[PDB]
Amino acid sequence: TFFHPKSREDILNEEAKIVQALNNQRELTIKMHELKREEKDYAHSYSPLFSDPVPQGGSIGKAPGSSRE
Amino acid sequence: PREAAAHWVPFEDKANMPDNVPDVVEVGATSAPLLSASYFIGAKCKPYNDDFMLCREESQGSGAIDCLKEGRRVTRCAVSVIEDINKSCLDEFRLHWQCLEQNNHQLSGCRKAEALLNKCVFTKLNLEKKIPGLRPDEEPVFLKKDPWIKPAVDDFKSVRAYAEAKKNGTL
């Protein structure tokens, strides 16, 4: 009579909830390992404001014919 | 670019231009008359010079081979300017550039002859000197009445001519 255990069903549901959360952490971990080591944008990596990488040089003797694409 | 360093032998090239590139006369005027005529040239060859530098910019590396027509028109505009000067305003031009050569090509030492030249070419060729980028407030330095900087020796022929021309009212 003093034996008052939790039922089989509630036990199985609790273990299932635990395993579900562990699988959620697994997917989050993989997804972040993938989000890192993914190529970013230049603005996120170097310069948000001057996002044009292209280097403009000096101006004291700017020769027409020195720009190129 | 840079200058030669540590050793350098001049070397020419006795070849001729390709037959697909026509022929153009050269300006053949030296540093001093050319510097005198700079302003009159720029007042007349402005669109042509601008088109030249624009086609050099658009070409993006091939400017030496794509801009030949434009440089040719520039050279011809220049020759027309200097021919108009020598035909019409010769002695005044000679006064200016000799006054320059007896200085360090500082234009400050030649203002009298420069005045006679601007007057004559404005009356005949209708070309005036103008320094751009200035406000209406700023006073251009070639029209200042009593400038701070004056030559070591005002040129003789220039001074005699300036005085005789004020006496004659030409200025």
GROMACS .gro file of C-alpha atoms in nm:
model
  240
    1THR     CA    1   0.000   0.000   0.000
    2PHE     CA    2   0.282   0.245   0.076
    3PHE     CA    3   0.413   0.178  -0.275
    4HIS     CA    4   0.292   0.490  -0.459
    5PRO     CA    5   0.509   0.517  -0.771
    6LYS     CA    6   0.462   0.746  -1.064
    7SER     CA    7   0.278   0.572  -1.346
    8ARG     CA    8   0.445   0.431  -1.654
    9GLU     CA    9   0.284   0.693  -1.873
   10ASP     CA   10   0.395   1.003  -1.687
   11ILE     CA   11   0.746   0.864  -1.662
   12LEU     CA   12   0.762   0.804  -2.036
   13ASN     CA   13   0.630   1.152  -2.108
   14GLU     CA   14   0.888   1.313  -1.880
   15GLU     CA   15   1.176   1.121  -2.035
   16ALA     CA   16   1.042   1.215  -2.377
   17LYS     CA   17   1.035   1.583  -2.283
   18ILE     CA   18   1.395   1.560  -2.164
   19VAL     CA   19   1.511   1.388  -2.481
   20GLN     CA   20   1.322   1.642  -2.688
   21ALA     CA   21   1.499   1.932  -2.522
   22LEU     CA   22   1.833   1.760  -2.564
   23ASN     CA   23   1.763   1.716  -2.934
   24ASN     CA   24   1.669   2.083  -2.951
   25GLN     CA   25   2.006   2.176  -2.805
   26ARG     CA   26   2.168   1.943  -3.056
   27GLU     CA   27   2.006   2.115  -3.350
   28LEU     CA   28   2.090   2.459  -3.212
   29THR     CA   29   2.451   2.354  -3.170
   30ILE     CA   30   2.481   2.224  -3.524
   31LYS     CA   31   2.304   2.528  -3.663
   32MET     CA   32   2.547   2.760  -3.486
   33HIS     CA   33   2.850   2.560  -3.591
   34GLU     CA   34   2.716   2.618  -3.942
   35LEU     CA   35   2.627   2.986  -3.889
   36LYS     CA   36   2.980   3.052  -3.783
   37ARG     CA   37   3.226   2.948  -4.057
   38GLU     CA   38   2.979   3.083  -4.313
   39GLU     CA   39   3.095   3.367  -4.529
   40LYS     CA   40   2.971   3.705  -4.408
   41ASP     CA   41   2.934   4.042  -4.578
   42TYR     CA   42   3.212   4.299  -4.598
   43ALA     CA   43   3.015   4.541  -4.383
   44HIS     CA   44   2.969   4.289  -4.105
   45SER     CA   45   3.338   4.197  -4.127
   46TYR     CA   46   3.532   4.523  -4.179
   47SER     CA   47   3.341   4.850  -4.216
   48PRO     CA   48   2.967   4.914  -4.186
   49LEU     CA   49   2.990   5.271  -4.303
   50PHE     CA   50   3.249   5.278  -4.581
   51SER     CA   51   3.136   4.948  -4.723
   52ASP     CA   52   3.297   5.017  -5.062
   53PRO     CA   53   3.619   4.811  -5.046
   54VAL     CA   54   3.756   4.978  -5.358
   55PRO     CA   55   4.060   5.187  -5.265
   56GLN     CA   56   4.063   5.546  -5.379
   57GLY     CA   57   4.420   5.668  -5.367
   58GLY     CA   58   4.588   6.004  -5.353
   59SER     CA   59   4.462   6.324  -5.508
   60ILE     CA   60   4.763   6.555  -5.551
   61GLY     CA   61   4.836   6.438  -5.905
   62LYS     CA   62   4.527   6.246  -5.997
   63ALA     CA   63   4.587   6.130  -6.352
   64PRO     CA   64   4.284   6.076  -6.575
   65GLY     CA   65   4.335   5.723  -6.696
   66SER     CA   66   4.424   5.571  -6.358
   67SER     CA   67   4.079   5.452  -6.261
   68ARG     CA   68   3.992   5.101  -6.370
   69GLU     CA   69   3.726   4.836  -6.323
   70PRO     CA   70   5.624   5.882  -6.215
   71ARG     CA   71   5.974   5.907  -6.074
   72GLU     CA   72   6.296   6.035  -6.225
   73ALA     CA   73   6.594   5.832  -6.338
   74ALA     CA   74   6.808   5.688  -6.063
   75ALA     CA   75   7.175   5.591  -6.040
   76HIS     CA   76   7.224   5.563  -6.416
   77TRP     CA   77   7.034   5.641  -6.735
   78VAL     CA   78   7.128   5.673  -7.102
   79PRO     CA   79   6.888   5.866  -7.325
   80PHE     CA   80   6.776   5.662  -7.620
   81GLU     CA   81   6.559   5.773  -7.908
   82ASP     CA   82   6.359   5.586  -8.170
   83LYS     CA   83   6.408   5.671  -8.535
   84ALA     CA   84   6.079   5.511  -8.644
   85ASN     CA   85   5.767   5.676  -8.784
   86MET     CA   86   5.404   5.673  -8.681
   87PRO     CA   87   5.169   5.406  -8.821
   88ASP     CA   88   4.995   5.485  -9.146
   89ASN     CA   89   4.651   5.452  -8.980
   90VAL     CA   90   4.727   5.749  -8.750
   91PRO     CA   91   4.723   6.080  -8.944
   92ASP     CA   92   4.974   6.358  -8.904
   93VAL     CA   93   4.958   6.659  -8.675
   94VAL     CA   94   5.184   6.961  -8.635
   95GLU     CA   95   5.356   7.022  -8.303
   96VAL     CA   96   5.333   7.332  -8.089
   97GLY     CA   97   5.706   7.399  -8.100
   98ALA     CA   98   5.684   7.679  -7.845
   99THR     CA   99   5.907   7.670  -7.541
  100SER     CA  100   5.839   7.705  -7.169
  101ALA     CA  101   5.804   8.082  -7.145
  102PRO     CA  102   5.577   8.183  -7.435
  103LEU     CA  103   5.374   7.875  -7.361
  104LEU     CA  104   5.329   7.978  -6.999
  105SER     CA  105   5.234   8.326  -7.115
  106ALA     CA  106   4.977   8.186  -7.355
  107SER     CA  107   4.840   7.932  -7.105
  108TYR     CA  108   4.544   8.142  -7.009
  109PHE     CA  109   4.443   8.240  -7.361
  110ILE     CA  110   4.471   7.876  -7.463
  111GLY     CA  111   4.260   7.753  -7.176
  112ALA     CA  112   3.999   8.016  -7.245
  113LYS     CA  113   3.966   7.877  -7.600
  114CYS     CA  114   4.054   7.506  -7.576
  115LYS     CA  115   3.846   7.435  -7.264
  116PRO     CA  116   3.591   7.194  -7.420
  117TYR     CA  117   3.858   7.021  -7.622
  118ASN     CA  118   4.089   6.967  -7.327
  119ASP     CA  119   3.798   6.847  -7.119
  120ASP     CA  120   3.692   6.601  -7.386
  121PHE     CA  121   4.049   6.477  -7.405
  122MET     CA  122   4.077   6.406  -7.036
  123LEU     CA  123   3.732   6.251  -7.036
  124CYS     CA  124   3.814   6.004  -7.310
  125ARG     CA  125   4.136   5.919  -7.127
  126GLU     CA  126   3.929   5.846  -6.818
  127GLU     CA  127   3.667   5.637  -6.995
  128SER     CA  128   3.925   5.421  -7.169
  129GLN     CA  129   4.067   5.294  -6.839
  130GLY     CA  130   4.417   5.197  -6.951
  131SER     CA  131   4.409   5.233  -7.328
  132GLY     CA  132   4.416   5.611  -7.319
  133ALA     CA  133   4.739   5.634  -7.511
  134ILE     CA  134   4.580   5.455  -7.809
  135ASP     CA  135   4.215   5.568  -7.792
  136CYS     CA  136   4.253   5.944  -7.729
  137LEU     CA  137   4.463   6.036  -8.034
  138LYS     CA  138   4.186   6.230  -8.211
  139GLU     CA  139   4.118   6.433  -7.902
  140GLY     CA  140   4.480   6.517  -7.843
  141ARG     CA  141   4.506   6.614  -8.206
  142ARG     CA  142   4.222   6.863  -8.181
  143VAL     CA  143   4.382   7.004  -7.866
  144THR     CA  144   4.713   7.055  -8.045
  145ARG     CA  145   4.543   7.228  -8.334
  146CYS     CA  146   4.352   7.464  -8.107
  147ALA     CA  147   4.680   7.554  -7.941
  148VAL     CA  148   4.854   7.620  -8.270
  149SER     CA  149   4.572   7.847  -8.378
  150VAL     CA  150   4.614   8.044  -8.056
  151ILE     CA  151   4.987   8.095  -8.087
  152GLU     CA  152   4.962   8.176  -8.458
  153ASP     CA  153   4.704   8.441  -8.379
  154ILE     CA  154   4.942   8.581  -8.120
  155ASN     CA  155   5.251   8.592  -8.339
  156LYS     CA  156   5.058   8.737  -8.633
  157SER     CA  157   4.892   9.007  -8.424
  158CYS     CA  158   5.045   9.065  -8.080
  159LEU     CA  159   5.405   8.964  -8.134
  160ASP     CA  160   5.612   9.231  -7.963
  161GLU     CA  161   5.396   9.235  -7.652
  162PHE     CA  162   5.425   8.859  -7.627
  163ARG     CA  163   5.802   8.892  -7.655
  164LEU     CA  164   5.808   9.152  -7.382
  165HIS     CA  165   5.615   8.920  -7.157
  166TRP     CA  166   5.814   8.605  -7.203
  167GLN     CA  167   6.152   8.779  -7.195
  168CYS     CA  168   6.052   8.954  -6.874
  169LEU     CA  169   5.968   8.606  -6.749
  170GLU     CA  170   6.294   8.449  -6.858
  171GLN     CA  171   6.488   8.716  -6.670
  172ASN     CA  172   6.303   8.589  -6.363
  173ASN     CA  173   6.228   8.236  -6.241
  174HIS     CA  174   5.910   8.225  -6.452
  175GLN     CA  175   5.740   8.401  -6.163
  176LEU     CA  176   5.450   8.586  -6.321
  177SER     CA  177   5.473   8.854  -6.050
  178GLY     CA  178   5.774   9.014  -6.219
  179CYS     CA  179   5.598   9.079  -6.550
  180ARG     CA  180   5.268   9.247  -6.465
  181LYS     CA  181   5.311   9.545  -6.696
  182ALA     CA  182   5.376   9.339  -7.005
  183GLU     CA  183   5.100   9.105  -6.895
  184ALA     CA  184   4.865   9.401  -6.885
  185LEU     CA  185   4.956   9.511  -7.236
  186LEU     CA  186   4.912   9.155  -7.361
  187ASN     CA  187   4.573   9.103  -7.198
  188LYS     CA  188   4.452   9.433  -7.336
  189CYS     CA  189   4.567   9.367  -7.691
  190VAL     CA  190   4.439   9.011  -7.711
  191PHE     CA  191   4.107   9.112  -7.558
  192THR     CA  192   4.065   9.388  -7.814
  193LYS     CA  193   4.165   9.173  -8.112
  194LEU     CA  194   4.112   8.802  -8.041
  195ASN     CA  195   3.846   8.852  -7.769
  196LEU     CA  196   4.018   8.635  -7.510
  197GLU     CA  197   4.051   8.741  -7.147
  198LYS     CA  198   4.250   8.599  -6.858
  199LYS     CA  199   4.039   8.454  -6.578
  200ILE     CA  200   4.133   8.270  -6.259
  201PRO     CA  201   3.834   8.048  -6.168
  202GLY     CA  202   3.731   7.899  -5.837
  203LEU     CA  203   3.724   8.243  -5.677
  204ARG     CA  204   3.437   8.422  -5.509
  205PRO     CA  205   3.321   8.765  -5.623
  206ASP     CA  206   3.484   8.892  -5.301
  207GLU     CA  207   3.841   8.773  -5.361
  208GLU     CA  208   4.059   9.012  -5.561
  209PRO     CA  209   4.264   8.833  -5.830
  210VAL     CA  210   4.634   8.888  -5.779
  211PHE     CA  211   4.714   9.018  -6.128
  212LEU     CA  212   4.479   9.316  -6.079
  213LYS     CA  213   4.597   9.424  -5.734
  214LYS     CA  214   4.707   9.786  -5.745
  215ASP     CA  215   4.985   9.775  -5.483
  216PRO     CA  216   5.089   9.415  -5.422
  217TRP     CA  217   5.316   9.311  -5.141
  218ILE     CA  218   5.553   9.117  -5.366
  219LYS     CA  219   5.740   9.309  -5.633
  220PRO     CA  220   6.026   9.209  -5.862
  221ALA     CA  221   6.389   9.263  -5.787
  222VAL     CA  222   6.415   9.472  -6.106
  223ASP     CA  223   6.123   9.588  -6.314
  224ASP     CA  224   6.212   9.521  -6.674
  225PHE     CA  225   6.325   9.821  -6.870
  226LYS     CA  226   6.148   9.783  -7.204
  227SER     CA  227   5.828   9.682  -7.026
  228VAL     CA  228   5.838   9.993  -6.811
  229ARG     CA  229   5.902  10.230  -7.099
  230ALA     CA  230   5.615  10.076  -7.292
  231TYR     CA  231   5.375  10.089  -6.998
  232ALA     CA  232   5.445  10.456  -6.945
  233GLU     CA  233   5.412  10.545  -7.312
  234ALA     CA  234   5.086  10.351  -7.327
  235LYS     CA  235   4.935  10.531  -7.031
  236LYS     CA  236   5.039  10.854  -7.204
  237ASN     CA  237   4.868  10.727  -7.520
  238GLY     CA  238   4.564  10.600  -7.327
  239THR     CA  239   4.594  10.247  -7.469
  240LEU     CA  240   4.566  10.121  -7.110
   0.00000   0.00000   0.00000
